[PDB]
Design a protein around this ligand. Structure first.
Ligand code: 2LI
Length: 380
């Protein structure tokens, strides 16, 4: 249908977006973080101070132990666990059940977040980056192989301010297709360069219409990916420095502590007086499937200035990286993103929950003629 899947995501700002899932027999309900930046399906399977509930394998008649250990280290957090298989469903997803690999998390460190409301993670990327090795079939590969669900999903991650009905921000994960009521305008597609992370190629970057003027290999230095499990826009050292230099220049009328630009300190303004006009729009051009059909996604300050609290407070959500460009949640917010795995491409369109701005508007625009995968792709 797809209507049954609209609004199936919830989350707290900066703590990921999650979807309801069931595991075992009888079905045990768990909220699971949707992560396109990994490929392991893992759930709390032991008591933890921040876990409201967890997966009890002893109470599932369909549980099968694989007699194998596993661990996954992320950017900061990590967990270890025991591999097994079990029946998995998504109540607000397709009407199907599948036997999938499940990493039963037995110990963890800085993985679970206090009061987040999620108890596990659903890695939606490819087998190549799955631990302990690529022989561990990811959930989405299992879903597609065992059912007739088409090989593609879409994510509409919404920012704050939209009606929901535990709170702040919602979204949609349409499994097996594209829901047209979730976006406006045209969907533009960029190739998945390789099936491991959802890797793409950035061919140009503009700040307030002014080209950053860098060797485009710098934009994809190491790699460039789409990652719903990461909050910030992460930029390679050199791009980060040139970008923050343009953003500081554009916003020079006001001055902020060095801590602000490092993403550690917050900045506030009397309620409703946020001076959005002095922060520029960032345009990221993605390589077209055909290079005279490239396109840009335009990000407003309402996206890269993430709202928090203690009247209107904000965190700078652009960070330095030594591991490539990561287009995180703040980038995906306000766009409808199609992970068209069947045709090895990712689509972008303006979301129905796009960010406001009285004088500017987020956009997905093209066509543009640009450089190639060969000119812009870093070869590792
Ligand atoms: C912030 C973060 O760590 N997000 C991850 C999901 C997550 C959400 C959460 F709420 C708590 C938590 F502990 C983890 C997500 O998987 C991160 N994904 C990347 C990644 C980094 C370290 C290793 C991994 C694999 C080995 C592949 C799992 C992935 C993708 C690749 C990459 N290059 N630079 C940065 C990244 C981020």
């Amino acid at each position: 249908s797809f209507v049954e899947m609209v609004d199936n995501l919830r989350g707290k700002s900066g703590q990921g977006y999650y979807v309801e899932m069931t595991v075992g027999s009888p079905p045990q309900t768990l909220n699971i973080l949707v992560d396109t930046g990994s490929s392991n399906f893992a759930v709390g399977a032991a008591p933890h101070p921040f876990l409201h509930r967890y997966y009890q394998r002893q109470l599932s008649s369909t549980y099968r132990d694989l007699r194998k250990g596993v661990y996954v280290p992320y950017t900061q957090g990590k967990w270890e666990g025991e591999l097994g298989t079990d029946l998995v469903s998504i109540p607000h997803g397709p009407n199907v059940t599948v036997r999938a690999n499940i990493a039963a998390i037995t110990e963890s460190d800085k993985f679970f977040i206090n009061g987040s409301n999620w108890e596990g993670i659903l890695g939606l990327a490819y087998a190549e980056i799955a631990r302990p090795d690529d022989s561990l079939e990811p959930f989405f590969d299992s879903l597609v192989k065992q059912t007739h669900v088409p090989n593609l999903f879409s994510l509409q991650l919404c920012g704050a301010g939209f009606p929901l009905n535990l709170a702040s921000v919602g979204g949609s994960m349409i499994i097996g297709g594209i829901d047209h009521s979730l976006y406006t305008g045209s969907l533009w597609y960029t190739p998945i360069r390789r099936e491991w992370y959802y890797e793409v190629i950035i061919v140009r970057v503009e700040i307030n219409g002014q080209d950053l003027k860098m060797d485009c290999k710098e934009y994809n230095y190491d790699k460039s990916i789409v990652d719903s499990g990461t909050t910030n826009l992460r930029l390679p050292k050199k791009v980060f420095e040139a970008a923050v230099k343009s953003i500081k220049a554009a916003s020079s009328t006001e001055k902020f502590p060095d801590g602000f630009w490092l993403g550690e300190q917050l900045v506030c303004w009397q309620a409703g007086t946020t001076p959005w006009n002095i922060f520029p729009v960032i345009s990221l051009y993605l390589m077209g499937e055909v290079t005279n059909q490239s396109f840009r996604i335009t990000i407003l300050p309402q996206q890269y200035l993430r709202p928090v609290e203690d009247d209107d407070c904000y965190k700078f959500a652009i960070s330095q990286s030594s591991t490539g460009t990561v287009m995180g949640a703040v980038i995906m917010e306000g766009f409808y993103v199609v992970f068209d795995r069947a045709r090895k491409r990712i689509g972008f369109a303006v979301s129905a929950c796009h960010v406001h701005d009285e004088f500017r508007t987020a956009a997905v625009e093209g066509p543009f003629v640009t450089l190639d995968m060969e000119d812009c792709g870093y070869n590792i």
